[PDB]
Amino acid sequence: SPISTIQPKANFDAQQFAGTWLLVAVGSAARAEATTLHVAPQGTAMAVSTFRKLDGICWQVRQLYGDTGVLGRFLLQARGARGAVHVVVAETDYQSFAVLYLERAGQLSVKLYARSLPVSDSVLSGFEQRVQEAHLTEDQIFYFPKYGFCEAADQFHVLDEV
Numbered sequence: 001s002p003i004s005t006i007q008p009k010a011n012f013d014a015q016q017f018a019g020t021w022l023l024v025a026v027g028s029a030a031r032a033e034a035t036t037l038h039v040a041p042q043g044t045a046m047a048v049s050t051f052r053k054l055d056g057i058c059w060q061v062r063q064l065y066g067d068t069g070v071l072g073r074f075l076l077q078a079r080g081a082r083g084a085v086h087v088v089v090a091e092t093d094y095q096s097f098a099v100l101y102l103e104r105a106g107q108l109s110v111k112l113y114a115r116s117l118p119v120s121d122s123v124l125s126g127f128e129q130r131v132q133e134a135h136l137t138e139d140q141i142f143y144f145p146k147y148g149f150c151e152a153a154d155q156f157h158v159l160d161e162v
């Protein structure tokens with residue numbers, strides 16, 4: 001459980017973290033790009049919609065990330081073939097960037113999200129520092145396009161996992 005060694009954002013405020021986030025980069029050893037996040041607090045949990053543009057078509061996945069008893073740490077419960085996904089919001093100023101850690105089957109990944117583009121050099125460099133600290137190399141970092149985003153899918157391309 002590599003993610004247990006990660007410190008969550010001190011006094012994480014779901015209300016301030018709400019809204020739209022754009023994926024900037026991902027650090028992962030895991031063996032179709034571009035992504036948008038819509039986060040809406042739901043009591044103690046977080047209602048989350050992710051959008052990805054594939055072959056010009058927008059696909060939406062609706063999920064619920066439950067509260068785990070620790071601020072900044074959430075859980076996407078397993079269901080069927082989908083394994084559980086642990087999430088920790090680490091560094092974030094709510095107004096420009098967010099560094100999230102995800103773990104599935106013991107494999108840790110790191111994602112950098114931004115409120116708008118481009119992200120500052122200091123944040124990008126900071127993210128890269130965290131990736132190397134997560135024992136991942138520069139070649140395990142995938143930087144996403146500064147275009148190709150979408151944030152609305154029709155009823156035929158919505159996967160509701162809630």
Ligand SMILES: CCCCCCCCCCCC(=O)O
Pocket residue numbers: 037039046048050065074087100102
């Ligand atoms: C506050 C909860 C935030 C949850 C962020 C989830 C980010 C997208 C994770 C996508 C995982 C995957 O499908 O590989």
